[PDB]
Amino acid sequence: SMTMEELQREINAHEGQLVIARQKVRDAEKQYEKDPDELNKRTLTDREGVAVSIQAKIDELKRQLADRIAT
User: Fold this and answer.
1) What is the DSSP letter of 41?
2) Which of 38, 51, 62, 70 could make a disulfide contact with 21, Cβ separation 3.0–4.6 Å?
3) Mutual orientation of helices 38-70 and 4-34 as an angle, nearest 10°?
4) Which DSSP symbol is given to 35?
């Protein structure tokens, strides 16, 4: 239900979000190391999970796109 152009835009949008997400992991790391309390720990772990999940969506979108070039 996506054109090829839509699929590529969706890949590019997620790739942008990944870069932003990894930045927020870096910041949450330093915050955690400055002050390693439970809330700062939780926030780092959640920032990490967000990066993992975006990467998984990118992987899936790229798999679709590859399969359609093949198709």
Assistant:
1) H
2) 51
3) 160
4) -
